[PDB]
Structure formats: structure tokens, C-alpha cells
């Protein structure tokens, strides 16, 4: 009976463990715990995530510093063929000698795991070559990542305002950002690639000493400022390159032009820079769009205002979306999440087919454990995006302040919203499941024929518009030429965005009936996943079974029995429920690539083609083919090259399974036997007097819906982690 | 008494067992355990302080 760790009092007291568990897992929920004032909160998140950026550089520093005493470059640049370039050195006392088996990799002594993380191709990927040239890495990033803490404090301390009001503008900021930040953040990048990196790519080297002496050119920047611009692009490259040494390397910065390369895939070095340049006007022209107290341009209300495309004669309001989104801070952190969420996959689905990188994809392990750490996440977001926009509705949000008014109206006409959502799923449900059992009843019925498969136009058709090239068509009014495009031609799309059909690494792979299902079963994912998040959100404020359900909106998990019987009916426990389908879409989707890719690489393609079609033999081959290798790294007659992975893969099946307790157990049974199991000591010798500071308990009634999950998840996400790698590494592909 | 225990437990069941070393038979690691043990033991005598000499 002591007073103890503070912000809360409610927490600060119960002896029972809930005091710790809970202690950690409020820390972050600033609004409305003991301390908090709208001036506290804001700043109390500001010097928080200045504690951010900060931790992202102690990560990055070491990323570059468990490289360059050991684990190659000065062998991986020399010229790097799909063997096993290194991150770091493993050091565990538990190891056997059988450690001598890799757990050691050709050149280096230390046994290490070597890198699946993307970089080695990007540190190299622009310049940064040289093994006597680099230990730089931390030195900078870190003589940076401490400054990252310095404002943290400096701007902490009142003297120099941490500043409360200041946090609500917009206009000024974002009138600053999408110019100051992004624009010049590009530009400056456009800067770097071009003076110091492209020269390295064709390259011969920059040497540390001279910035002025190094010129791209002989007669120098040249009119340029003068616009010709054009003629950079004459004889920029010469495709048959010998990359990073010239000989035909050529020097006119920048292009559209020439090659997909058998040596490199990816994206001509210049172009990632006119682009980085090119966009850096639009954002700079964009930045400078709203006010900063000079008297030009725009005020963020009064374009929303009475503005409005439809109705204008409809009867739906615009009024103050701006102080309800400004005033919310959750609306904020949830249009933040998504955008990032939608683009985290646009990142990661473009990063393949369009990798920017020397010697990647066709490196093609690391191309398949990097599409997904950006598919996991990205899915992992979205949920949280949808989850801070059902907290806006309860903590913030103002029914009189909002009304008639389009965000409202969303609540109002909501019963429909979940229905014309649930109608999509149920349809997208049984109809994908007719097609896949039927497809599996047929087979093993031994009529394969009388299989039902749609070869699914709609994509193939997109990608005529683009092309090429598989067997023609005219397609009436294109016709495979005659009408060509005519307005456009030799300029722009050239040889580029012409791999065409191209099994090895096309961009576009040639889609059939196997893809007309997964593609309808990724679609049944984000739909179901969102009928529950849309719903989860819509009535966090709550409904009939609960009218009330508020002022804790979010996590009040459980309610008494009676009424109908009431349960996981907090907007958190629908978020809680949501995260299973974000772990089921972001599984069908990822699952898909790989099988495809795999087969594509010593590849039949065919095999996915007949073996996408039906459900069994999605196990049998894939899933059943190709665990092959990993499962014995143990195999009784001694241990082979991968052991981390397979042990992780079973670590994978345990963490998962052991979810279930949490999940089919429900505090009641656990607490009660702890009532008998805390009669032991109190009763049994040499165990006695002896006092807990915290009273034994069984975990609260929200807590374990989490923990099974945050448990269900690792297992699951640590199994595919270990699965794909433990199989795209041997191969065969 | 609890002392000379924790020998054959980690000198006859030791990690790569039945030792040929001068050390074990052994103090070794076990002497290390009485240290971890003995202070895991102390920061429990911060449950009671109640502090005197009588």
C-alpha cells in the first residue's frame, strides 16, 4: 500500500500485477492521463518523436558500421554474383564447430548471416565504393542522430518556445513542408546523385579532395542555366556498358533511352534524377500555395467553406472540417496513416518490376524479403489508420459542431455503409470458394478437364494498351499498328516500358486463370478487413445493443452478460478482430508473389499456371514443395547450412499456437486457480512470510485479446520470414 | 548447505559434460550462480527495510 509509478493514480495503486503490465502500455497514451493539457500533450508528442528521427539514425549508423571492417564490399563490388554478401558477424557461445559450415561464407572468418536487407546494392547502388574510402557511415549519421536529441531537449525547455498555439496553423506549415521539405529534399538529392554518384555509376571515381576540379564535363556547367536544355541526351550512355567503367560508358547526364540490361536490371541511372529534379519544381510551385501573413494566395477554410462540387444545391454542408480535423489530432494521425499505408505498398509493389538497383532482382532472394516488409507494415498500417479514425469519433468529434455536414452524414447514413460493404464480401466470398473447391473436386476426380477456370481478361487487356509483346491482336482501333499512337511515338516510351513478354524479368508477367482468383481473393480481403474497420469505426460511438458506448469509446472490452449477451464490441476489439484479416490478405497477396518468381527463376512458368488454379497443391507444391531444404538443417545426420531459419520456423509454429491460450481462455478460469495456487505459499513452509509486492492476478479482459495476437502475429510473421528465406536461398526456383 | 549442492548438477550434467579440466568437478560457473542468486537475493531486502539496530 504504497504510492508508485506516476502518471496515473488509478493505476498507481492496485497491488495486483495489473499495476505493472498496464504501467507499460499507458505510457504512450498522453491525452487524458493525469498530466495533460492541450499544451502539454502536443509538445509531449513533439519532443517525443524528436526522440524519433533520433533512434532511426542509431539504427542506420550501425547498418553502415557492421559493414566495412568485415563483410564485403571490396569483394562484392569487385563483382557480385548471387553468392552471399554479409551484414554482420554472429557470435554465440552455444555454437558447435559445425559452425565451420557456413555459419561462414568463403572469404570472411567470422560466421555471419549476410545481408537480405536491401542496402548493399544501395550503398553501392550509388557510388560510395571504396574499401579504403569507407568507414564513413555512423560518423556522419551519428554526428547527426545526436542533434536529433538536442532539439528534443532544447525545444523542450520553455525559454525558447516549445510553443503551444503554434501547432494548429497549417497553411504556414505544409505551406512550408511541401516546398522547404520535400521539394528541396528532392532537389538536394537531384543535386547529389548528379555531381557525386552518376560519375561513380558510369564511373570513374570522384576523389575526396576535389569538388571544383571534378566536373562532369570539359567546358563546364555550360549554358544550362541558359536553357537549351535538351542536349544532355545525346549519346548519354552506351548500352553495352561494363558498368562503372566507361569504355563506352559515355558522359551526357540523363536520359529516357536505351536499355533494360542483361547486366543490371533497373532504372537507368540518370533518370532517377531528372525525375527527382523534375518533380522538385511542382512541389516548389506547390509550396507557396497557402498563406504566410504576407498577403498572397490561400486560406484553408473558405476553399472548403461554402466551396463544393456537388450539391451546392444538394443539401450537404462543408463547414469546419478544418477545426474538427485540426482540433482532433487523430483525424490527423490517420490521414497520416494511410497515404503512407496506401503508398507503402505502391513503394513496395513498384520496387519490384521496377527496382532502382544495380544487381537486384536477379539477386532475387532479397527482392523477395523486401516486397513483404513493406507489405507487412503497409497492411500493418491501414489498420492503425482506420483505428485512429475510430478514436477521433470518441475522444474528439463534436456532433453539434459537425452537423448536416458531410463527415456527419457519414454516421447518419451508416447502416447502409456496412451492408453494401458486407454484400461485396459475402459475394466475393462464396463465389471465390465455389471456384477453388470445384476446381479441386474436379481434380482427383481425375477429370482435370471440366475444371472451371476463367482466363481473366481484364488485366491482359490493360497491358495491350501498354504492350509488348505477346501475339498481336489488333484490338479494333489500335490493330497492332496503323493507328499506332501517332501523336506520340519515338519520344517518351522508347525501348523502355518495352520488356514486352520477356520471361526472365519483364515487368509484366503473363497472367491467366490462376491469377483470376488470388486477385479476387486479395479483393475479398480488403473489404472484409474493412467492413470490420469501417464498422469498427462507425460505431465506436455505438448502437442499439449499446447506445451508450462512450467516453472510453475505444478499449472498454467486454460488457455484462444479459441484454442479448455482449462482448468484443469496443471499436478496439473490432480493430482487435480486424488485424486477423490484415494478417490474411497481407498473406494471400504475399504468398502469391513467390510461387510466381520462384517458378519464374529456374522457371517453368507453367507450374503456377496449372497450380494457381486450385487449393490443394497450393499445399502440395509450394508450401509442400519447397520447404524441402530448410527442415533439415537439423536433419538427423548432422546440421546443414541453414539452422537459424528452421528453428525460427518452429519458433514460428510455437509463438503462434501459444497465441490461442490468450484467445480461448478468458481471464475467469485463470484467476480462480491462482486463488488456489496462492493458498500454496501462504500455507506451505520455507515459502512463507515472504511477500509479493504485487498480488497475484490473471490478465485483464482486454489485455489477453491483445497478447494472443502480438503473439499470434510474431509466430505467423516470424514463420514466413523464416519460410521464404529458408527456401529462396537454396532454390531451385 | 545449499552451497556444495550445484556441483554434479553443473559438473556432471555440465554443458559439454564429464570434464577434463582443473576447474570443474568444479567451482566454475556454479560460483557464478551463487552470485546471480545472491542478489537476485538482495534486491528483495528492499521489500522490507524497516530499519534499526536493536
Amino acid at each position: 500500500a504504497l504510492r508508485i509509478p506516476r502518471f496515473s493514480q488509478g493505476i498507481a495503486q492496485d497491488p495486483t500485477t495489473r499495476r505493472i503490465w498496464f504501467g507499460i502500455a499507458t505510457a504512450h497514451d498522453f491525452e487524458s492521463h493525469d498530466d495533460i493539457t492541450e499544451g502539454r500533450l502536443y509538445q509531449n508528442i513533439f519532443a517525443s518523436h524528436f526522440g524519433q528521427l533520433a533512434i532511426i539514425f542509431l539504427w542506420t549508423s550501425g547498418n553502415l558500421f557492421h559493414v566495412a571492417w568485415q563483410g564485403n564490399f571490396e569483394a562484392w563490388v569487385q563483382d557480385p554474383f548471387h553468392v552471399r554478401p554479409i551484414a554482420h558477424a554472429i557470435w554465440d557461445p552455444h555454437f558447435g564447430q559445425p559452425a565451420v559450415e557456413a555459419f561462414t561464407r568463403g572469404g570472411a572468418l567470422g560466421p555471419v548471416n549476410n545481408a537480405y536487407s536491401g542496402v548493399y546494392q544501395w550503398w553501392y547502388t550509388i557510388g560510395l565504393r571504396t574499401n579504403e574510402d569507407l568507414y564513413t557511415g555512423a560518423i556522419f549519421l551519428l554526428f547527426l542522430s545526436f542533434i536529433s536529441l538536442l532539439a528534443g531537449w532544447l525545444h523542450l525547455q520553455p525559454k525558447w518556445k516549445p510553443s503551444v498555439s503554434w501547432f494548429k496553423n497549417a497553411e504556414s506549415r505544409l505551406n512550408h513542408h511541401l516546398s522547404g521539405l520535400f521539394g528541396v529534399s528532392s532537389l538536394a538529392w537531384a543535386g547529389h546523385l548528379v555531381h557525386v554518384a552518376i560519375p561513380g555509376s558510369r564511373g570513374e571515381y570522384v576523389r575526396w579532395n576535389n569538388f571544383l576540379d571534378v566536373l562532369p564535363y570539359p567546358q563546364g556547367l555550360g549554358p544550362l542555366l541558359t536553357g537549351q536544355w535538351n542536349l544532355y541526351a545525346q549519346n548519354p550512355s552506351s548500352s553495352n556498358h561494363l558498368f562503372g567503367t566507361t569504355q563506352g560508358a559515355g558522359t551526357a547526364i540523363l536520359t529516357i533511352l536505351g536499355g533494360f540490361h542483361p547486366q543490371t536490371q533497373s532504372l537507368w541511372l540518370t533518370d532517377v534524377a531528372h525525375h527527382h529534379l523534375a518533380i522538385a519544381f511542382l512541389f516548389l510551385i506547390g509550396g507557396l500555395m497557402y498563406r504566410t501573413n504576407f498577403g498572397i494566395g490561400h486560406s484553408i477554410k473558405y476553399i472548403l467553406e461554402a466551396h463544393i462540387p456537388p450539391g451546392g444545391r444538394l443539401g450537404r454542408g462543408h463547414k469546419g472540417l478544418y477545426d474538427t480535423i485540426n482540433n482532433s489530432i487523430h483525424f490527423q494521425l490517420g490521414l497520416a496513416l494511410a497515404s503512407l499505408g496506401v503508398i507503402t505498398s505502391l513503394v513496395a509493389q513498384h520496387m519490384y518490376s521496377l527496382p532502382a538497383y544495380a544487381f537486384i532482382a536477379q539477386d532475387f532472394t532479397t527482392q523477395a524479403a523486401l516486397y513483404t516488409h513493406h507489405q507487412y507494415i503497409a497492411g500493418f498500417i491501414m489498420t492503425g489508420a482506420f483505428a485512429h479514425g475510430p478514436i477521433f469519433f470518441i475522444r474528439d468529434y463534436n456532433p453539434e459542431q459537425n452537423a448536416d455536414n458531410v463527415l456527419a452524414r457519414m454516421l447518419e447514413h451508416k447502416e447502409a455503409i456496412i451492408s453494401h460493404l458486407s454484400w461485396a464480401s459475402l459475394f466475393l466470398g462464396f463465389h471465390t470458394l465455389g471456384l477453388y473447391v470445384h476446381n479441386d473436386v474436379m481434380l482427383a476426380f481425375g477429370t482435370p478437364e471440366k475444371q472451371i477456370l476463367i482466363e481473366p481478361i481484364f488485366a491482359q487487356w490493360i497491358q495491350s494498351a501498354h504492350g509488348k509483346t505477346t501475339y498481336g491482336f489488333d484490338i479494333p482501333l489500335s490493330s497492332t499498328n496503323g493507328p499506332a499512337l501517332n501523336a506520340g511515338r519515338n519520344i517518351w516510351l522508347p525501348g523502355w516500358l518495352n520488356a514486352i513478354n520477356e520471361n526472365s524479368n519483364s515487368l509484366f508477367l503473363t497472367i491467366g486463370p490462376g491469377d483470376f482468383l488470388v486477385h479476387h481473393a486479395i479483393a475479398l480481403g480488403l473489404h472484409t478487413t474493412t467492413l470490420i474497420l469501417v464498422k469498427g469505426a462507425l460505431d465506436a460511438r455505438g448502437s442499439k445493443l449499446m447506445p451508450d458506448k462512450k467516453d472510453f469509446g475505444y478499449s472498454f472490452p467486454c460488457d455484462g452478460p444479459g441484454r442479448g449477451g455482449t462482448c468484443d464490441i469496443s471499436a478496439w476489439d473490432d480493430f482487435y478482430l480486424a488485424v486477423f484479416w490484415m494478417l490474411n490478405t497481407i498473406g494471400w497477396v504475399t504468398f502469391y508473389w513467390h510461387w510466381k518468381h520462384i517458378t519464374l527463376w529456374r522457371g517453368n512458368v507453367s507450374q503456377f499456371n496449372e497450380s494457381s488454379t486450385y487449393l490443394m497443391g497450393w499445399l502440395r507444391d509450394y508450401l509442400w514443395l519447397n520447404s524441402s531444404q530448410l527442415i533439415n538443417g537439423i536433419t538427423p545426420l548432422v546440421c546443414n547450412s541453414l539452422s537459424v531459419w528452421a528453428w525460427m520456423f518452429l519458433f514460428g509454429h510455437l509463438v503462434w499456437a501459444t497465441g490461442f491460450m490468450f484467445l480461448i481462455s478468458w481471464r475467469g478460469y485463470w484467476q480462480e486457480l491462482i486463488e488456489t495456487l496462492a493458498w500454496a505459499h501462504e500455507r506451505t513452509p520455507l515459502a512463507n512470510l515472504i511477500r509479493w509486492r504485487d498480488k497475484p492476478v490473471a490478465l485483464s479482459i482486454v489485455q489477453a485479446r491483445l497478447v494472443g495476437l502480438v503473439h499470434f502475429s510474431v509466430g505467423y510473421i516470424f514463420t514466413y520470414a523464416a519460410f521464404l528465406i529458408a527456401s529462396t536461398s537454396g532454390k531451385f526456383g | 548447505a545449499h552451497g556444495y549442492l550445484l556441483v554434479g548438477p553443473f559438473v556432471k550434467a555440465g554443458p559439454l559434460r564429464n570434464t577434463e579440466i582443473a576447474g570443474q568437478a568444479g567451482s566454475l560457473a556454479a560460483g557464478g550462480l551463487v552470485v546471480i542468486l545472491s542478489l537476485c537475493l538482495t534486491i528483495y531486502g528492499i521489500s522490507s527495510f524497516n530499519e534499526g539496530a536493536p
Binding site: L2, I20, R693 | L39, I43, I46
Partner: peptide, 30 residues
């Protein structure tokens, strides 16, 4: 002397934990 860089796994993975599991039993008391 020859071959000896083994301290940044106990100081961290072993001893640093000792500190906090001790120390941070400040959550109980201090």
C-alpha cells in the same frame, strides 16, 4: 596477443540486462 573481441555480448546481452532487471525493480521500489 591474438584473437580476443568477446565482451560486447555479455556487457550487453547479459550484464546490461542484469543492471535493469535489478535497477528497474524500481518499478516495485527504489
Amino acid at each position: 596477443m591474438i584473437n580476443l573481441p568477446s565482451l560486447f555480448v555479455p556487457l550487453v546481452g547479459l550484464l546490461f540486462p542484469a543492471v535493469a532487471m535489478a535497477s528497474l525493480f524500481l518499478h516495485v521500489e527504489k
